[PDB]
Design a protein around this ligand. Structure first.
Ligand code: SAH
Ligand code: SAH
Lengths: 279, 275
């Protein structure tokens, strides 16, 4: 169910569409449910389409939430081992419950580990996922040292995060130094700022949120995430932030000066989402 | 020493004639230094991407007079470097330069056909191809032989032409790279800069002054004309001179490999806007 509570991309604003109402079934429209799931799948696929998971063994989600992402990957590719890190003992035990109910206990794990300073289970992951996690970590240099040192050579880091133009948002120059100092080479950056803003736009958001608080009930962690998502959409509309998808690879053999060059190209000139079609 | 490629000039240099300088009509040392610097700058765009202190093995599958692998060998005393050529003369001259430098252990030059013949090592960290693939017809066979001896994550550095001597369309480049697991890190367009290197307003007069005071033969004179026409075709943009920085990547999804390779071949970085 938590998989319905993530970002998505809409090419234009849809009057009557409210990601909050649709995800919770308050909107009974089957076609709007299709739109919600499609827009969330389209955003995830920008990152996931780069990886041939038949040639991958281990995945690390270093801020997994309720582990919706790694559970879906585990059910889609039944050979994958997926590890998630979370700071919340609540989320950690609720995630393993969801994992138990789906018979995924042999492959999918959720650990209460601080990804900024705590090493994961595997020495080298083939894929590392970070969807809106680094923005909530201020010790980003310690974090990217931990991520890169546990990424296989040539392995993929797949980030969805914010660029500045309680979150700790950083500038394009700071992203370039983060990746370059730890041997991470961008294959592509994709800017989805406007399309995510369209997805997040709910002009009845305040009314819709209060309805969920009193008519279905909401935990404090959930209400804080929903209000954060709304404020993120406003920052995107105001162009204070960009939402960018990073596809990077661990590369220890490229010269450091060239690494900074090619990371700067992608960070300062990401591909616009509306111009891409991969098939 | 000597390079069998073009160079890059940031702008047109009047009075500079690649034909006069490289073939001994012009005694100016400054213009000879310009020629060599323009040629070093072209290949340095490719070479400066590789941390050679972390490489052990380099394959130049069209080494010419072996000047590149000799310069790399003197630069990095740990590297092993192997060059292929089809020219007995070039091989003997390169080997003689290698022996004069005391590089006979680490630097090898063989007369072998890179389109079908296996190199000395099973896998290389770096493969170099500066104006080589354009002269090879069975390119699918060539890229299979190159990719099969490239370490995972290893580099392939190519200076070649894109047809907008056997030139290859943008779509053919994307398929040649993608079907052999090669992923472009970057493409750099040096078309106008090579056109500047090859620009000579007095070409026809210089080629005649080179024809009567130097021995040329008709084979060389026609090659010299073909190079001038190549420069003009770059100006007309029916041809592109492009530097490919590729890596062996067998883990990227094939669909995404084609997308990224198409992006760099269709939209390469202009040389003038690179810091
Ligand atoms: N330093 C850190 N180490 C491990 N997990 C962290 C972390 N900082 C934040 N997180 C985790 O990141 C999650 C929220 S931000 C990421 C949410 C996730 N991408 C999703 O879509 O579900 C929370 O579960 C929190 O525990
Ligand atoms: N099929 C083939 N196999 C091996 N070498 C080849 C080849 N086809 C062409 N060559 C070689 O590729 C070279 C092209 S001229 C390039 C020379 C060198 N790269 C330089 O920078 O100076 C020639 O030396 C030629 O002998």
């Amino acid at each position: 169910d938590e998989s319905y509570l993530t970002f998505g991309v809409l090419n234009e604003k849809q009057p009557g569409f409210s990601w909050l109402r649709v995800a919770y079934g308050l909107d009974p429209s089957e076609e709007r449910m299709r739109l919600l799931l499609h827009s969330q799948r389209a955003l995830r696929n920008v990152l996931l389409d780069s990886v041939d998971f038949s040639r991958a063994k281990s995945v690390w989600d270093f801020g997994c939430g309720y582990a919706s992402d790694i559970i879906a990957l585990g059910e889609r590719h039944s050979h994958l081992k997926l590890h998630g890190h979370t700071l919340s003992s609540e989320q950690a035990e609720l995630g393993l419950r969801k994992i138990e109910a789906r018979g995924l206990g042999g492959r999918v794990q959720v650990l209460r580990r601080d990804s900024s300073k705590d090493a994961p289970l595997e020495s080298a992951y083939d894929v590392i996922l970070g969807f809106e996690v680094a923005t909530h970590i201020k010790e980003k240099r310690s974090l990217f040292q931990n991520l890169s040192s546990h990424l296989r050579e040539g392995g993929f880091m797949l980030l969805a995060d914010f660029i500045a133009n309680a979150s700790y948002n950083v500038t394009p120059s700071q992203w370039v130094e983060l990746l370059s100092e730890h041997g991470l080479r961008l294959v592509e950056c994709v800017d989805v700022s406007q399309e995510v803003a369209n997805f997040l736009f709910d002009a009845d958001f305040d009314a819709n949120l209060t309805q969920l608080e009193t008519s279905v009930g909401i935990s404090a962690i959930e209400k804080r995430n929903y209000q954060a998502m709304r404020n993120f959409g406003a920052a995107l509309e105001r162009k204070i932030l960009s939402y960018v998808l990073f596809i990077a690879q661990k590369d220890s053999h490229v010269r450091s000066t060239y690494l900074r060059h090619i990371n700067q190209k992608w960070v300062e000139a990401p591909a616009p989402y509306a111009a891409r079609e991969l098939m």
